[PDB]
Design a protein around this ligand. Structure first.
Ligand code: B12
Ligand code: B12
Ligand code: B12
Ligand SMILES: Nc1ncnc2c1ncn2[C@@H]1O[C@H](COP(=O)(O)OP(=O)(O)OP(=O)(O)O)[C@@H](O)[C@H]1O
Ligand SMILES: Nc1ncnc2c1ncn2[C@@H]1O[C@H](COP(=O)(O)OP(=O)(O)OP(=O)(O)O)[C@@H](O)[C@H]1O
Ligand SMILES: Nc1ncnc2c1ncn2[C@@H]1O[C@H](COP(=O)(O)OP(=O)(O)OP(=O)(O)O)[C@@H](O)[C@H]1O
Ligand SMILES: [K+]
Ligand SMILES: [K+]
Ligand SMILES: [K+]
Ligand SMILES: [Mg+2]
Ligand SMILES: [Mg+2]
Ligand SMILES: [Mg+2]
Lengths: 180, 180, 180
């Protein structure tokens, strides 16, 4: 049974031996990353023939978000479990995509209102849920030692979702609307 | 008029005579349950010919979430209003579904990335919004006496959404993807 | 490059010279408004031939939410930047729509469960995300001087989304379901 009932009184296990209240900032941080991961799954389910080129990288992001969650669930002083997430390669990978998608779409200097195609709009939702998760991670960092590589990656990831959302509109030739 | 303007300065009425700031943990708790309820409505709107068997129980969950919200909005010491939510029957009902859906889908021991069909992905989003609401309920419980039956049910409900999401993928023969 | 990396350590610039941690209540408040704005974009992407009459006003709301975010990002004592958002005209505009949509749909005295068509369900999600943003704005207001016009408008806006959701169901002749 996936239901153990052990969480019925409001406490839960993290990685290692510690238990925490479910509203503890650590649990909120990796919980928000799980919410983001689920939204990325939902976004991927909206891919169509015009936007197939985005499918594989969204799946890759889901794998990465699991790695980020793992590290957020791991206390820095846990002897039996180490941080596994290293920002450099995944973050450079995001930056290459951001560069490519920024270059290819029509240039703007004005704010774009988030929207357009259903997929582009979902990528803007991903952008903002990523940023909400990021706020939670910073709340955790102010109380506990974290793997700061996760913060670097999560920061860059919301720029990826912005750039990808504009690219998704481009792929269907849907214009972005500007803030008046 | 549904707009009374009484909330324009940031305070609002709960059940009974009390008013609270809108960011009070009580208001946040039943507000998050309302957000979950709206997401469940959205998820139900995605039902298709393959997944019709899930429609009625999602509606039932919406009725239950209203009952949970009511109790969260009710102070334990309110003389004129009592708790109405009793966990036993609805929670056993969820567990029977969890058992049936766990049994029928392909077995895994590895983490599944949340996604697949649009409905399954939406059920994973429901899973994570349920868990966010749960965190809020625990925040409330640490400051005020609550109907702990709501916490039991909300805990079990996110396991229901996990099991139902895998079942929704099964109903369309969409494989779950595993964490590498 | 849209990625400056300046946020990689958890601090960010608001309007004017101040930097704040990303979990600061000010950043959370306008961050939640950005999340709402993205959800409004997503909702607009669901418009169909039955519901085209709702498209333009959703776009207008997105423009207004940018104005609200701007003011939330602006300290009251910032000498170089002023509040731009004035509630009266946009709020009266919302109230006229609320009146018109309340009048036209079938009357109820009982709670409606949030759902129905995909668009109506998305408008209920908008309703609840608006209310979450509102809670964040009240958290900010309790610590800092804000443009209270934003709070007035955001309060009224969740009533707009309720009324519009019922109207979206009406436009497709989808009944609302009542709480038993
Ligand atoms: C951390 C953790 C997670 C993390 C995963 C890591 C991360 N990205 O942060 C998150 C929060 C995502 C997660 C989610 C869930 N997990 Co988990 N996870 C754990 C935990 C604490 C560590 C497991 C681990 O990494 N193994 C070491 C390598 C354990 C608790 C334990 N026993 O260690 C559970 C635990 C494995 N997971 C559990 C469950 C039920 C879940 C969820 C189904 C809960 C839910 N209803 O959403 C989901 C499933 C997610 C999925 N898509 O498969 C149960 C499994 C029970 C069982 N016998 O099947 C465990 C044992 C916790 C418990 N005792 O209740 N969890
Ligand atoms: C608690 C409560 C809710 C809860 C419902 C209970 C729960 N599940 O937690 C929640 C937060 C879900 C809710 C939502 C809304 N409710 Co309400 N609800 C109340 C409240 C406080 C109690 C009503 C009650 O249960 N009656 C006793 C049995 C009252 C305030 C009051 N006057 O008592 C309003 C109140 C009935 N609701 C109100 C409104 C407007 C709403 C919303 C439309 C607000 C919004 N824009 O989202 C939604 C509608 C939800 C729907 N789908 O029908 C107004 C109705 C005004 C009117 N004359 O029509 C009231 C009177 C509050 C107010 N004075 O502003 N609310
Ligand atoms: C406040 C602000 C926003 C607000 C907008 C105002 C509001 N509604 O609250 C919000 C939070 C919505 C926002 C979002 C983003 N913004 Co902004 N915004 C700012 C800020 C602080 C003020 C700009 C402004 O209003 N100009 C004065 C009139 C600046 C920082 C600065 N340099 O002033 C950036 C800044 C302009 N924005 C930036 C970025 C990258 C973004 C986002 C792409 C971030 C993201 N990944 O989501 C999004 C894009 C949103 C869109 N749809 O176009 C960067 C632009 C970098 C560049 N050279 O292109 C800036 C310069 C911040 C930075 N240094 O990192 N932001
Ligand atoms: N509401 C929540 N939000 C975020 N993370 C959670 C929440 N509840 C539990 N967790 C984390 O996710 C893991 C899996 O959740 P799960 O629901 O199985 O835990 P539980 O609630 O403690 O147990 P059970 O649900 O079996 O009573 C937990 O071990 C914990 O790390
Ligand atoms: N932002 C919010 N988040 C969660 N719950 C809320 C919020 N605002 C109000 N509530 C709760 O939901 C009920 C209905 O909300 P409603 O918007 O009608 O209240 P209000 O904002 O106090 O009044 P009004 O909107 O008419 O000025 C309230 O009585 C209160 O219990
Ligand atoms: N996680 C967040 N949530 C909400 N608002 C944010 C967040 N991060 C930054 N902001 C606000 O949004 C604006 C744009 O965000 P952006 O990501 O460009 O900032 P940054 O993270 O400080 O910089 P960079 O991402 O280039 O390292 C910021 O100037 C700040 O006002
Ligand atoms: K469980
Ligand atoms: K109201
Ligand atoms: K940036
Ligand atoms: Mg950033
Ligand atoms: Mg649980
Ligand atoms: Mg209100």
């Amino acid at each position: 049974k996936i239901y153990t009932k052990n969480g019925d009184k409001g406490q839960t296990r993290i990685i290692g031996k510690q238990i925490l209240y479910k509203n503890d900032p650590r649990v909120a941080a990796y919980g928000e990353v799980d919410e983001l991961n689920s939204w990325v799954g939902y976004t991927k389910s909206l891919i169509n023939s015009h936007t197939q080129v985005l499918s594989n990288e969204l799946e890759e992001i889901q794998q990465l978000l699991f790695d980020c969650g793992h590290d957020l669930a791991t206390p820095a002083d846990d002897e039996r479990h180490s941080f596994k997430f290293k920002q450099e390669q995944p973050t450079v990978w995001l930056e290459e995509k951001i560069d490519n998608y920024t270059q290819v779409v029509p240039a703007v200097k004005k704010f774009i209102l988030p929207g357009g195609t259903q997929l582009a709009s979902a990528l803007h939702v991903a952008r903002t849920i990523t940023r909400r998760a990021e706020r939670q991670i910073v709340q955790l960092m102010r109380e506990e030692q974290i793997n700061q590589d996760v913060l670097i990656f999560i920061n860059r990831l919301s720029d990826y979702f912005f750039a990808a959302a504009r690219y998704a509109n481009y792929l269907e030739q849907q214009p972005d609307m500007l803030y008046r």
